[PDB]
């Protein structure tokens, strides 16, 4: 399943200095980008528009523009009312997935609200001042109707357009390569195993152990580094039709 995630970061230094930057991921692939220094949402793949028309897409272009400027000023004004202190960080994570949707908002890196049903609701562990913000946001009937239309109708119709358009790149397979090394000793030693240059993301590497994090390469391929304190290294992956990558020490 390939969820579509739309991310936003809005930073407020003082009441004069602010920035808002955004992005969209389709599964692991990033399909859009949108910076503060730009009056448009930028497409990244030749299929980023999916099965939407130019007129359809341009309408989306017009909505986001109005929203970015309004969001900014709504937040500066909320700052006075709620007497909050600068700096302020706000983040938004919105989207859906074709089989339900979502729209979460965070402040200083903690959840505060979200868009359920037809309106805004707080999160279980939120401050009292959030009640004031929820009370005001829920007055704008047109915005509440517009977020519903966007999540219930526009997003799901959009994601499909993408899936029948980016079927090559999504169902693509890249083979990894692998090698061993000797790190810094803890008379103990450290056996490090390096697996790099694979795609898609789901992978499997063990010593047959500290299986490291999956780290990104700049060509949308991935990288992994599992270690052991003290023998073989084995890697499974979809690209390897059962035939695993066994490297011996």
């Amino acid at each position, epitope marked *: 399943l390939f969820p579509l995630r739309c991310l936003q970061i809005s930073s407020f230094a003082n009441s004069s200095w602010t920035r808002t930057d955004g992005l969209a991921w389709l599964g692991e692939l990033q399909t859009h980008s949108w910076s503060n220094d730009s009056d448009t949402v930028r497409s990244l793949k030749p299929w980023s528009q999916g099965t939407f028309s130019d007129q359809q897409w341009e309408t989306l272009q017009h909505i986001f523009r*109005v929203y970015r400027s*309004s969001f900014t000023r*709504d937040v500066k*004004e*909320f700052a*006075k*009312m709620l007497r909050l202190s600068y700096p302020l960080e706000l983040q938004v994570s919105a989207g859906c997935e074709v089989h339900n949707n979502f729209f979460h908002v965070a402040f200083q890196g903690k959840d505060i609200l979200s868009f359920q049903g037809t309106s805004w609701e707080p999160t279980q562990e939120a401050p009292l001042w959030v009640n*004031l913000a929820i009370q*005001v*946001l829920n*007055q*704008d*009937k*047109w*915005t509440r109707e517009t977020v519903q239309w966007l999540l219930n109708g526009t997003c799901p119709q959009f994601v499909s357009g993408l899936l029948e358009s980016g079927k090559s790149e999504l169902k693509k397979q890249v083979k990894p390569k692998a090698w061993l090394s000797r790190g810094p000793s803890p008379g103990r030693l450290l056996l490090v195993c390096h697996v790099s240059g694979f795609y898609p993301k789901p992978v499997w590497v063990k010593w047959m152990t500290q299986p490291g994090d999956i780290l990104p390469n700049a060509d949308e391929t991935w990288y992994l580094r599992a270690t052991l304190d003290v023998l073989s290294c084995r890697v499974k992956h979809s690209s390897l039709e059962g035939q695993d990558i066994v490297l011996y020490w």
Partner: T-cell receptor
Amino acid sequence: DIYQTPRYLVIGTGKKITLECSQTMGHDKMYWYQQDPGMELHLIHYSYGVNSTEKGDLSSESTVSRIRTEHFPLTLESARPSHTSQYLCASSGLRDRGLYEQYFGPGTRLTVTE
Amino acid sequence: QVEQSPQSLIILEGKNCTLQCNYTVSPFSNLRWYKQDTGRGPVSLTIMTFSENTKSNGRYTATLDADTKQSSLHITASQLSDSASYICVVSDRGSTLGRLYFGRGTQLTVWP
């Protein structure tokens, strides 16, 4: 349902002045405008609720207080002759349709003499 | 941000008139027309959103063309009690979080 007392007011120069405004509904949002005869309304103060007191689109020597929802008093620290004007109070709330209308008080006329 | 026209005008009773209001406010939520008698508070006449092109409150009738950002107030069968100041204000949000923009008003004198 929005009240302003008194309706008229004479006072001497250099003394303090307080202007009453009250509303029997429960509207949070409230505004103070100052309007010179034969001219426009200028916002001088407003409030989003109790303990909220923001300066408006005009720099007056006045101050407001919102310690109670229903009352929004305007106060002149030390009155000068140039404070002679008309002062209107107002509020915002949900009404006949599904929108937030603004309702104005009747107003108060202040004359400051020497 | 919000303009009205004319500044003032003088008509005789029994005649119709039309008052203009132009705005550059974006984004747009709704627009109201107020009537202010000398030495009194303004009185709500009408409020309109973009999805409406007409509203009538008694002898008063407001239209709103959202596409050219203009609304006009039309007084039918004027009389001496229509002498007042007529104000038009625009709001840029559908909540109390908005900003209100006022016109300088229009003074209307009605003679016998």
